Amino acid sequence: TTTLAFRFQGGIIVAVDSRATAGNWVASQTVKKVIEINPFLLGTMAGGAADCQFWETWLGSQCRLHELREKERISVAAASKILSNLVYQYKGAGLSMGTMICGYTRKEGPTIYYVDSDGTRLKGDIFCVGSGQTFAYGVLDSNYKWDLSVEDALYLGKRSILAAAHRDAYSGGSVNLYHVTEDGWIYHGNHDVGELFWKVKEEEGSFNNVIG
């Protein structure tokens, strides 16, 4: 896996790859690593596939039960803490999860929480999670500004996953883009690295290490 999400002027960008591996065997190139919890909440998935998928769909059920009981959408903080408290109960049992709970509410504004399987829970503006997190960080950090436009922010997120997809052997397939605003999340398409790499190489002039 490579997954990222960063906060900026125009809300939150969330970008993920779609590869799944079993050792060196590429098992899938079309995995959905973003879970759509509700129109205002997203969750990213890295680590054990079953662990992430099972518990984040479970998280969605707990969020639904909150708004039925409280007649109000759950906060990003509360949603992330449900997941972090859950994995903490299983600490030492061998769960493998690197997740990011991203969303918007009125009281909080745009918010991102990093939550992992050893119980760590951190609020923050920028996070990259997965085997190719460092490759994404390299591109993202060196090009990040708070004042990025929605168009530029979407591209930087896409370009950061592409960078990791290229270098990290255990990342690839395609890029899934999301944009989170005050009005909720908006899907910005599936982008196959097969066509995207060459399109980016030609137009941007980058990737000069590769034989053109």
Partner: protein, 195 residues
Amino acid sequence: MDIILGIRVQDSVILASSKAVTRGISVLKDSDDKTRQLSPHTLMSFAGEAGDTVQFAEYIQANIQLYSIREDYELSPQAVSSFVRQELAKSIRSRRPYQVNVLIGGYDKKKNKPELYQIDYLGTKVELPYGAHGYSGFYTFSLLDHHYRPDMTTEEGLDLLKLCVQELEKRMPMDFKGVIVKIVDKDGIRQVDDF
């Protein structure tokens, strides 16, 4: 020993190497030069196991200098890199192998081209536009994939290198006390004193 980087541009090769020497919970030195001049137009940086690194570098340096005196001629970077690779390829099947990783930056005067070679302790050689050893690569490679262009100048290369060091200083766990930068071109080897 930890961070060594290398970038080949249009007319030169630039090597950056961390200054910190750490043993246990103490930084013993913060001004260490992790490189040796093999010949006037060839420079080798190194990183790995304590003691092995310097012992290996100086041993190579002595051999290349011996060749230069014998033939009154400077070996090409390609020739030096091949010699270095073979020494490491011997080493890996010895009783006690050299645990040293190197970058060899040189300027070929016959071809009038800069050349950067990355060689690991196993004797694995590759020619590259940009290279790194250790955990550094996990950040710098993707960064350079994006920002690097083949026709860049030496000044553009130094800015590109500053971008790498900044990223490393932000996301690396250990304090590596900055880097010593050196440039290899048609006029030989020189050190950037203010980085």
